Amino acid sequence: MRKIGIIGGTFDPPHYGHLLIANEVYHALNLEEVWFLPNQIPPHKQGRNITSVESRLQMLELATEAEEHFSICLEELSRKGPSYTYDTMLQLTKKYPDVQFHFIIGGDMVEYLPKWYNIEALLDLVTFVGVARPGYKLRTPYPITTVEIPEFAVSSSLLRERYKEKKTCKYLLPEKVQVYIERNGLYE
Amino acid sequence: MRKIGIIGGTFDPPHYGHLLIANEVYHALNLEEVWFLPNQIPPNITSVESRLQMLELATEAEEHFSICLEELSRKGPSYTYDTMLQLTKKYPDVQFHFIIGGDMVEYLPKWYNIEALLDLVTFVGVARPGYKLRTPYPITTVEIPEFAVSSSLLRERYKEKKTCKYLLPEKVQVYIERNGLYES
Ligand SMILES: O=C(CCC(=O)Nc1cccc(Cl)c1)N/N=C/c1c2ccccc2cc2ccccc12
Numbered sequence: 448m449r450k451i452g453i454i455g456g457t458f459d460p461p462h463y464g465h466l467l468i469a470n471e472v473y474h475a476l477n478l479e480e481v482w483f484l485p486n487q488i489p490p491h492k493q494g495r496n497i498t499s500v501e502s503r504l505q506m507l508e509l510a511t512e513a514e515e516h517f518s519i520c521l522e523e524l525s526r527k528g529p530s531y532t533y534d535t536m537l538q539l540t541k542k543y544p545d546v547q548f549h550f551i552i553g554g555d556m557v558e559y560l561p562k563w564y565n566i567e568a569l570l571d572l573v574t575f576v577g578v579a580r581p582g583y584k585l586r587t588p589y590p591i592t593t594v595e596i597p598e599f600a601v602s603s604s605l606l607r608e609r610y611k612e613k614k615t616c617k618y619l620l621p622e623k624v625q626v627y628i629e630r631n632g633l634y635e
Numbered sequence: 636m637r638k639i640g641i642i643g644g645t646f647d648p649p650h651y652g653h654l655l656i657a658n659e660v661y662h663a664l665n666l667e668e669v670w671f672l673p674n675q676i677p678p679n680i681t682s683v684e685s686r687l688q689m690l691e692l693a694t695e696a697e698e699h700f701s702i703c704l705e706e707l708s709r710k711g712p713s714y715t716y717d718t719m720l721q722l723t724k725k726y727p728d729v730q731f732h733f734i735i736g737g738d739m740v741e742y743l744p745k746w747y748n749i750e751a752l753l754d755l756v757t758f759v760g761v762a763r764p765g766y767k768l769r770t771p772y773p774i775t776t777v778e779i780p781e782f783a784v785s786s787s788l789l790r791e792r793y794k795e796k797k798t799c800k801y802l803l804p805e806k807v808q809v810y811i812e813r814n815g816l817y818e819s
Contacts, residue, residue: 456741459741459769486742486745489744489772491771492772492773493773495771497769529744529745530745531745531747532745553738554785554787555736558644558647558674561675561676561712562674562713563745564714566712579787580788583785583787583791584787584790584791586680586786586787586790588677588680589677602766603769604763604766604767605766607767607769608766611767
């Protein structure tokens with residue numbers, strides 16, 4: 448079976464941290480490809496902004512288009528509302544019978560896996576890949592694959608605050624995404 | 636209504652980072668107290684006995700910290716919705732503030748029964764100075780400096796037979812090395 452990584456999130460915006468993690472897992476586990484899986488976001492409760500599906504998808508394209516081994520999976524983003532990861536992976540399993548899915552999660556996610564919807568059934572659909580800091584181990588009763596990656600501290604929350612302050616985020620994310628964000632006045 | 640915080644996790648082991656977060660939220664939102672909510676771990680795992688004892692030792696001297704056994708009172712893991720449904724039933728006079736890491740926030744829409752859970756708790760997202768949380772849901776933000784102590788860091792130090800002095804309460808360290816936890 449084809450070894451394919453999945454990295455999910457809202458990518459709001461995508462940045463070098465996401466690419467670094469995707470790349471590290473790609474090399475560490477000798478994957479064929481990594482699919483970025485943009486999540487759906489429910490409409491805001493209190494008349495504030497969420498970043499459109501259109502904008503998030505385009506930023507993601509700009510962030511990944513340079514890498515032949517990165518692709519985008521629209522399974523969640525095409526639906527009307529959020530999806531449980533179990534339901535998504537069930538659907539990807541039906542659509543791609545010959546793929547072994549390696550589902551990337553942060554080290555801090557790991558202790559909370561037992562609280563995921565249909566976790567037991569999901570374990571039969573994917574191999575989890577927990578990203579841990581150098582030399583440190585993840586503790587979980589579940590079978591998981593560990594990949595070591597330094598914590599680089601860049602986050603979407605950091606970048607949004609900078610854009611709110613009308614600063615550049617050059618060197619924290621692909622040039623092309625920075626250009627797109629400031630041009631369309633995102634995160635202001 | 637009494638304002639009470641909830642901080643959940645496996646606490647494996649509890650450490651100054653957990654206490655720092657509970658304390659910051661306690662002070663920021665003028666809470667009555669904060670309840671530590673140990674999670675169940677499905678079938679090496681640290682025994683419930685051991686995790687509870689460590690939590691007890693970690694919170695012994697803290698006046699405004701208590702332990703809530705709700706999730707340990709059930710056999711297997713619980714969704715947070717299940718837990719908060721029971722706690723709201725048990726404490727109708729309480730406004731619960733459920734503490735989550737800033738990294739959790741974008742994934743809230745994937746939590747089981749999130750819409751119904753929003754009717755049961757106020758979420759408190761903790762964020763590093765300079766970080767802005769973004770979610771469609773009502774949430775309260777509390778600024779907390781990152782501290783870089785984690786249970787994973789500690790477990791590895793103990794496996795290497797290093798001390799974790801200054802990273803968690805003395806009484807917890809003593810319990811850990813006496814009982815040989817994290818030795819493997
Ligand atoms: O889809 C996901 C995680 C995807 C992800 O973890 N992607 C990712 C993306 C970039 C880098 C890395 Cl290290 C990981 N599910 N997350 C849900 C989720 C919980 C769901 C139910 C019950 C509890 C949950 C707790 C979570 C805590 C942190 C982060 C996510 C949590």
